[PDB]
Symmetry: D2
Subunit: 474 residues, 4 copies
Amino acid sequence: VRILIKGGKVVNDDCTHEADVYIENGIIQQVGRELMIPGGAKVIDATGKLVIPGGIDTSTHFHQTFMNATCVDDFYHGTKAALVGGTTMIIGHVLPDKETSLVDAYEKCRGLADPKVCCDYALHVGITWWAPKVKAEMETLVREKGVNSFQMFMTYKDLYMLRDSELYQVLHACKDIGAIARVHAENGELVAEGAKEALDLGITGPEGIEISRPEELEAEATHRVITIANRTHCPIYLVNVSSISAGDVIAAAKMQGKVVLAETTTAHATLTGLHYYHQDWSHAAAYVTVPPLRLDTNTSTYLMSLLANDTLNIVASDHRPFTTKQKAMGKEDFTKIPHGVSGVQDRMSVIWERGVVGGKMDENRFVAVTSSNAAKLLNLYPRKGRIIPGADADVVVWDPEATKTISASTQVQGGDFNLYENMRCHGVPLVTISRGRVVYENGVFMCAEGTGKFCPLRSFPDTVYKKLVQREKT
Amino acid sequence: VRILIKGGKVVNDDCTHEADVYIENGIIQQVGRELMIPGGAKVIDATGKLVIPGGIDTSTHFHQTFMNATCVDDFYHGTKAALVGGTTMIIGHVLPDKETSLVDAYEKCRGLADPKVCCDYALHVGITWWAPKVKAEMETLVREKGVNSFQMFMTYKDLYMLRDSELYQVLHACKDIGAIARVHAENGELVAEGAKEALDLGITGPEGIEISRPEELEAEATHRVITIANRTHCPIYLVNVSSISAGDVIAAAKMQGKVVLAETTTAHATLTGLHYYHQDWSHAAAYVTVPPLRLDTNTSTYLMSLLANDTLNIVASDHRPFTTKQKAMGKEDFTKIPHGVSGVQDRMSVIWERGVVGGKMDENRFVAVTSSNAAKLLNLYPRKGRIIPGADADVVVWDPEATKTISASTQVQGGDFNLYENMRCHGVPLVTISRGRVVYENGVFMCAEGTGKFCPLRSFPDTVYKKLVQREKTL
Amino acid sequence: VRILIKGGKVVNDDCTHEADVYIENGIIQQVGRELMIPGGAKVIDATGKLVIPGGIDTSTHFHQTFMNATCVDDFYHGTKAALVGGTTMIIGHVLPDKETSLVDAYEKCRGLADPKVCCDYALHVGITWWAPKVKAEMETLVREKGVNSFQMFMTYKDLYMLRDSELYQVLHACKDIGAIARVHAENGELVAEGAKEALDLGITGPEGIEISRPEELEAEATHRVITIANRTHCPIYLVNVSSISAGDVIAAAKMQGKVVLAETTTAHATLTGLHYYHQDWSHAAAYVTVPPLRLDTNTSTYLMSLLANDTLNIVASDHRPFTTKQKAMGKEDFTKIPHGVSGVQDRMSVIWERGVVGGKMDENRFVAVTSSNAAKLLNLYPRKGRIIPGADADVVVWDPEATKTISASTQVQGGDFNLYENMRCHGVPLVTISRGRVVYENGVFMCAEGTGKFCPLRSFPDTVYKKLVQREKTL
Amino acid sequence: VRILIKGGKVVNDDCTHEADVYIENGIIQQVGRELMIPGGAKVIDATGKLVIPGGIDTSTHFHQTFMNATCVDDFYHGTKAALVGGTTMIIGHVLPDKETSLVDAYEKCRGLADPKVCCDYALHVGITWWAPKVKAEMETLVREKGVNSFQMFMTYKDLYMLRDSELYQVLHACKDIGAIARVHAENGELVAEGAKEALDLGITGPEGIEISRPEELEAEATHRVITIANRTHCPIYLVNVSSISAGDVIAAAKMQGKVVLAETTTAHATLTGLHYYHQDWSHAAAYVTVPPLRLDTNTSTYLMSLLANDTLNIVASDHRPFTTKQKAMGKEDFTKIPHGVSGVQDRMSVIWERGVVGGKMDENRFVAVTSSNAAKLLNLYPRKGRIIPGADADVVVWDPEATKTISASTQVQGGDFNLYENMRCHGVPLVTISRGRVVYENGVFMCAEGTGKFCPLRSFPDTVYKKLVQREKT
């Protein structure tokens, strides 16, 4: 399959230039103004369009059972939805139950994904308890199974939560093997007490998700894990950053030279918690995730600014849709509403609209936060996240002058609601190319299940570790 | 005993005015310009002097056995040193070991203090472990043993440290019975790992106390306990605040309306951690306390500004002297150097010198940080911490033109070193009056052991709790 | 006139206690529990009530002509409204035009006020231009006309604005004569350009007042004047603090030990700029003042926390009401809407409701922000701002269980709107006493015009300057 | 001239990879692992070396008369010194006297530089007063004379200082033509009063430079000009940032999405004001510049962290050496010591040593702050600041395992002192290539005067303006 993308502007995270792109055998072969190529190529007319690295979504939960509900999208449907939305790689989550094997949970995931994915992928592994067995398994995963990133929780007391002593040991273990420590930082003791107290106060509706875990619980846990990480000399990556208070902690730490990276989600960057107070229970429940969307109307604008200014590095969907019927497990008790929202298909368009069209960042910074920063952290740059010769041919022809009104009735991602219903969004993937084949064009998707491949992720990504390895020389 | 303090300026925390003060039967009877009094009063000449409430020292450790050493000063010597240095009330610590009775520990302390104290006193009670028996003991102490303040530690893993879940319950229990929760906020897991790591690196000298617990450990724990307290709705009182980082956390919280109070020590407000690097091991060890003094040379100036600005409310000595021989338990392993410094006799003069003479605060703010704020928090204001009619006659005649230079060779407090050696002090107590008797005058102390009394401390002090009643209606 | 206030709780800024208060010849003679007094005193029943120092309102504009409109309330009506609302002292503004005499302007004000005031008063003097004649007039005012506070503006380009070089000299001159420098800190060049730009964009409605001067203009000017004051060593007092951004600058400065004080208005501490977008033009215009109320809904809560935390020291009304007809001068051009709102009668009740009932501060902090801090800054403490023997008898019997709802239809202050329309207030003055006479009781005001007196204000108030003496020795 | 650089690692601001580089006719022709090239090329053995974009020094003052002293380095000697130190482009300053023509001052500079420069260069133009004539001249310079950057001062009352009203008009004028506004932000009224007061207090020694302009004067002016710029919608570029207080202002503004960029100097990033108290007057005077080095021992470490974290974008030398004899004009009155220090030759090595070796940033971030960020701001990226095919052949073979001890006795830059005397610095330019010729190798410099060329700088650099032009669409 030989593809010539003609007439567009190549947009990488560093700059934009007019150039044609020639793809063959899964790889970008040439980029330049006037290309000499063999005849017979599929020609895509990208006049007026931007030719960008396909999106890399660093947080997705295809096929995951969580809080007794099973995500509506499996690996085929999730990756299809990602491609239609202009994302060409997904990183999925493995979440072993406490005191169960990390490797078994990883293998189960590999089995669900390998025969089904439409696009390239890799996996983060959840560290949900600690013991010498767990440490050995971390070493195995990094050495043999193409993992370089672990996910920890400071919340979910009695299910997934790690205590300070255990985080210390975890982070020490991650740095010794060159892994990235992702952490969900909310104070789990206080979250547990807050939910019990909210229920006692008769707050049983979805707004309990906000009331029971005010932002100071995030700011506190964020401060604490950054301190633990600085003492262990481990790089720390905060996830689902949701609040001004937490953002301010991260910015203060970075100011002091601490080795801190952070991700937010589309929803936290663009939506407010007023959705929890909607008159329709089902609408309100669809927005329930953690940390929750905050009521302060300035929060989404602030987080967008931080994404533009590199206080936050990366934006992910955190895609974990449930049906209305599954969400309704919590109809009489908000603590049982399963945490999760839809977004894998929405991410690129929503961030283009609120970020770029809204004047918060430019097109190059859009590429950085949707693909290039992630590729770097993943140790896959410039194989991914960059339009250059030699890179993987994961490419999106992006129409910056098309709008689509977003609606659940027209989406292919799972869920009964779309969080961005009726939003007019001015940026559209016109063509999605994955592994050097057109998989989405003229509004039609086509790609066989299992076409995508697992991409092993190598330890010690320079973007983080070159600096750290140098500090420890003294 | 009838006393007339004539010719001075009365300095309270609100303002200064020229007035005489007449005392009888332990109580200030009159304050005013041309007083009509029965003849035969002892007349003290205070012309050129300031008449101030006696110092209230909210943290002292007389007779305490800690880290295998027992504090040099008992309740007689400690309270005498206090009085000579212009402090007329001390609050002592009780520290029951894990799984042992709080009441028994409090009773033992009362037994050691009641016959020995020279000045009024009360006691904080340490909460070092948690269980239903502990909660019942807290209730007993507040309901009938005159306690209204508990001390907890987020550090000293496996000795005194409470875990986060325990601290939540402890703070709920404190606010239910109207107590103040004092907390020593350093991250105890990180302190434990830092010390181990420092030793493994061959850092065994006194500077290990700094290296092993950098200020981020105090800032993190300070932030965490403020957050816990906010969720429990308990007033929270941070102790031994040592760092810019921690002070900034406290200020950011107060900005947000959180119910946060904070104390620092004389040493933290005036000295730097350079002392840990002194060529004499014994000198360095004498400065070892926790959180440690910080190397950042701006630290003491900043903490003094916060005391002036009311980000920090109160200055204490945290008096817990040990000898060089005792300190030498750690000569080859800094983690065994027992934590504690001398200061109960130095506090008023040193804070006067660095605070008032240094231009960071005026004489009225000096009274607030040395007596009045403490009296309010203890529920003893204006009985203490104010020169007014009706108040207890705990009064100091303070000379703001003094010729003193501090030296260990002339102090009466315990310890082989004085942290402030050779410091020139312009403010000193000329006369100390406690319970309406002169106990120190013309450089001579006289007071019989056991003259001081325990002062039961009433729960739900208004200065903290009156606000909290209305605040609760909105939460 | 002899008055006995019996059965109440005395609430000063330090603490609350049950006590009776006996007044004679304009002065509080006794405070205490079972008072021995001559018979035939007027007895006021204060059981269930709080006895507080009367309010001191540090910013009022009675009789002022401003922006081509003349304030609805003169000195009689303004002071009557004050007294009905529980405020017993007002500080008025003098504002001489550029190149005109400060003294003549002060004398004219004294002429308008002396025969009309119902309560005690004093005056701030505006410094709107600079030259040797001005410096000589400042000196005259402080040396013999009882002024100790000057007001300057960093905005109103070409009307009242001082340039940076002039402000430096003005502040040096103020600290030399021991005055307090009040400053309205918005960037006047940017305010001028913002207004022009807003009009050019067709923004002509009242919301222009917000759009044209966003909070960064106040934060920038606030930072700049603090910096100027620090270099001149002059105490600096920020007025009408309106924003989170400005408040954060002030707090950051105080953290650094700068000599900074700050006032806000009732409206800024309680209301938002949403009022500018009201469908009735007249309603929107009634809220127009500078700096404007801010749209950020967290603003008033934050400023109230700063008042509770002492980042802000004092709350004033800034009373300058205009009618709807006067305000309508700007119906087609918001820049001509004269700046000013009603509030002198509302201040005590509104701050009680949002401050004390809201749980942001307690009753004692309420006294500090409404009288005591002002008395200190004015050099009138404890003559005013404290219920003690010897103090002036300016006293309010305050009912903390009141049934009032605020409405313009029942107010006695001027203006067609009341900013707080329909607000339920639990705290109201039952009795107001001024100069030791009852002037308001049983809902009836009675006081003859001119009963109030000018109170000369002495230079170098200790609360600011006593520190500065020692600080100067280190600089 | 045909050059093959073989065996090294190409280090750009985004990543490092092993690759050979082939240069011909002033331009990088190929980059790649195994190159097919015509025979007869000059071969440089870069095994063990890093192949980097040559340094771009955005602030130099060759031939400038300032404070009645004339800089010791002219355009030949300055640019030679730059090349020996691994900097291949310099941006010089034009500073018209108040009420004199901007264009005449630019033309005089062009005349001094064109026949003398050894390396490529361009010029910033000082706006030292304001009137309608000045605005017309700005338009001319941008339209016709290859200027896109103006330098303003908030200090030097009565010589160069602009007042608030004049800055407003200046910044409005700069944004309308797509220029960058560089500003030296110290409060000039307060600086003037502070120097008068210091002298009155009998402080006449070099330490007066600190005492008379404490950091709050910078923080205040920095806050103010950022506010002016935000109101005018003009990009603002702070220069010679020197203090924690000012850095904190810049970081707070960036957090809020304001369009703020900032530069520091080598000396501010690495040295403290204790040098003002040296026992030798001449040593102390050599460090006198503005804003002054600060006494707070944490300042240089903090500013280095900010350079690593992108609070500060760019590091320049601000090279303006004077002799001991010229500095001594201020022997009895510090206010007459002419402001200026040597550094053009030191910059790359000092920042490599303190930045990279000290573990504050990695090698890629070193390239960003020494060349790539500047190229972007200058509208010259990726022509400069990047090793890629098509880029200008301005390249340095950098030895990361060589130390040189810095000493004035061995430098080629001007001045009697070197601020970094005796510093052991572990990174060395082994080879400097400018315009595709070797100009420095085996420790020997060779390049004819006038070989370098003026590089016109085009208006509206995307890195700043693409975002801004979008904001003003609403």
